[PDB]
Amino acid sequence: TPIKQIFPDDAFAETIKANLKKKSVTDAVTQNELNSIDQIYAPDSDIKSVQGIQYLPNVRSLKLRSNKLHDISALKELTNLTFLFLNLNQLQSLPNGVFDKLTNLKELVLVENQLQSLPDGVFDKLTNLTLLHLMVNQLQSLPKGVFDKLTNLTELDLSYNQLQSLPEGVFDKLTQLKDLRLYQNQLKSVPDGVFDRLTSLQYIWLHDNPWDCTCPGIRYLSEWINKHSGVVRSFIPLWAPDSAKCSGSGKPVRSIICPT
Amino acid sequence: KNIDGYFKIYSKHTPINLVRDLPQGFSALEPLVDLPIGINITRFQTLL
Amino acid sequence: GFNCYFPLQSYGFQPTNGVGYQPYRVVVLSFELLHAPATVCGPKKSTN
Numbered sequence A: 001t002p003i004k005q006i007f008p009d010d011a012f013a014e015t016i017k018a019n020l021k022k023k024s025v026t027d028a029v030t031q032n033e034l035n036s037i038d039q040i041y042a043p044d045s046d047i048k049s050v051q052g053i054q055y056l057p058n059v060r061s062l063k064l065r066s067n068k069l070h071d072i073s074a075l076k077e078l079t080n081l082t083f084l085f086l087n088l089n090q091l092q093s094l095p096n097g098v099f100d101k102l103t104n105l106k107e108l109v110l111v112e113n114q115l116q117s118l119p120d121g122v123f124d125k126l127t128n129l130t131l132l133h134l135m136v137n138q139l140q141s142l143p144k145g146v147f148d149k150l151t152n153l154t155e156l157d158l159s160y161n162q163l164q165s166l167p168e169g170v171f172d173k174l175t176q177l178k179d180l181r182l183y184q185n186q187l188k189s190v191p192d193g194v195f196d197r198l199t200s201l202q203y204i205w206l207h208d209n210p211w212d213c214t215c216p217g218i219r220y221l222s223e224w225i226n227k228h229s230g231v232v233r234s235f236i237p238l239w240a241p242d243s244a245k246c247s248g249s250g251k252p253v254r255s256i257i258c259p260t
Numbered sequence B: 001k002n003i004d005g006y007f008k009i010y011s012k013h014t015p016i017n018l019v020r021d022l023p024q025g026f027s028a029l030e031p032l033v034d035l036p037i038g039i040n041i042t043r044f045q046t047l048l
Numbered sequence C: 001g002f003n004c005y006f007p008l009q010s011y012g013f014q015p016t017n018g019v020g021y022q023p024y025r026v027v028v029l030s031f032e033l034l035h036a037p038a039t040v041c042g043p044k045k046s047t048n
Helices: A013-021 A219-227
Strands: B005-010 B030-035
Touching: none
Parallel strands: none
Antiparallel strands: B005 B030
């Protein structure tokens, strides 16, 4: 029997009953058979009312192309998600206590992270996160002592850093990072001590890398490379000192006689 | 001819020396080329 | 500078590296039915 004042959603119910292309209208309805869909695929789905969702646990990931939905109720007791996509530009805070059971999340995207400060122990329990994909992150806030208790993070974005002191063992003991990156690094002021512990280096990037020309700091390394120049590779095969081009000038490095 | 999505061409060469008049007689045209084209045609022209 | 980046970046894939970091080749075809006669179907079979 038809009942009025039950469904608030007209478009959503219409698309549910239309996209499936049922046999006829004279069939029965239930909830277990209707809720077999756990991932809703509805373009520009702006369902806001999610209150009392405790009777519908099977849904895990909800897609929302609703920039207007700023309600915190979408994350008060929704801790079964594994993907995040929210275009909430004015996100100045994150709800706490949702990490009590969040262990089934695999990949997240957190763009426009305007958090200039970070909380303590936020990632402390995330030991199971063996795979993290974080790209074009705006985490300008520098973590303060996170490597020495967690060795589990793999991918990081550390651009525009002025660290004069790198953490100890940040690449040595952490053997789980089989993928190591040093592509076209622009760290002009390299911390002293990088070249020693990298005896397990496999992926080398030395071509067109603009290292400094500080006499006589890097002079010994350049001489050692010159003596054994036959093992390195570059885009174009040329003289070894040419690859380590001096910053700015580019004139031959055999003209200045460095005083002792 | 262009019917049922196909383009058909028939031809025949008949040696008769006559002027300003279509020669009489009978001559059937043998099919030459069939084209699987299947497009809409309304007009035509010539490369004079 | 501020709110500006560069499109051209590279990760690095060499052919002598491990099998998980080497280029491959992919060829993709499509299957559909149209409202026209088919001129590409396949070979035939003949018997004595």
